Curated annotation (Swiss-Prot):
It comes from Homo sapiens (Human). Component of the BRF-1 ISWI chromatin remodeling complex, at least composed of SMARCA1 and BAZ2B, which regulates the spacing of histone octamers on the DNA template to facilitate access to DNA. Within the BRF-1 ISWI chromatin remodeling complex interacts with SMARCA1; the interaction is direct. Component of the BRF-5 ISWI chromatin remodeling complex, at least composed of SMARCA5/SNF2H and BAZ2B, which regulates the spacing of histone octamers on the DNA template to facilitate access to DNA. The chain holds residues 2054 to 2166 of 2168 of the full protein. Belongs to the WAL family. It is found in: Nucleus. Expressed at varying levels in several tissues, whereas a smaller transcript was expressed specifically in testis. Residues 9-113 form the Bromo domain. It comes from the Eukaryota. This is Bromodomain adjacent to zinc finger domain protein 2B. Regulatory subunit of the ATP-dependent BRF-1 and BRF-5 ISWI chromatin remodeling complexes, which form ordered nucleosome arrays on chromatin and facilitate access to DNA during DNA-templated processes such as DNA replication, transcription, and repair. Both complexes regulate the spacing of nucleosomes along the chromatin and have the ability to slide mononucleosomes to the center of a DNA template. The BRF-1 ISWI chromatin remodeling complex has a lower ATP hydrolysis rate than the BRF-5 ISWI chromatin remodeling complex.
């Protein structure tokens, strides 16, 4: 509360460390469904169903331009990518399996880097 603070966690490396995680996600062999925005002119149903589209290139641009206020807002956009994928794609599909694999990969890196 006023003039009463928990000890200050060092957050000075968070920007660099989120960039490294994102690089590792970008270079994973199962990243291909997530590298670019979904083409809303060419994929029937996507625009109406998926209220907040997100993809790795859009996260990368937001990161590079100071649009993430903290490391939790960064994790929310990465999770958004996988939640959108589960909403639109059957589990037993190449893209459905890709999203489960990437979410697992991301969550381990996140725990090992920050928790």
């Amino acid at each position: 509360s006023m003039s009463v603070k928990k000890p200050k966690r060092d957050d000075s490396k968070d920007l660099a460390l989120c960039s490294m995680i994102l690089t590792e996600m970008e270079t994973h062999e199962d990243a291909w469904p997530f590298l670019l925005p979904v083409n809303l002119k060419l994929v029937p149903g996507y625009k109406k169903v998926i209220k907040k589209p997100m993809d790795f290139s859009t996260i990368r641009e937001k990161l590079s331009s100071g649009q993430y206020p903290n490391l939790e807002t960064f994790a929310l956009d990465v999770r958004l990518v996988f939640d959108n994928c589960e909403t639109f794609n059957e589990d037993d599909s190449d893209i459905g399996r890709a999203g489960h694999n990437m979410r697992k990969y991301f969550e381990k890196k996140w725990t090992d880097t920050f928790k």
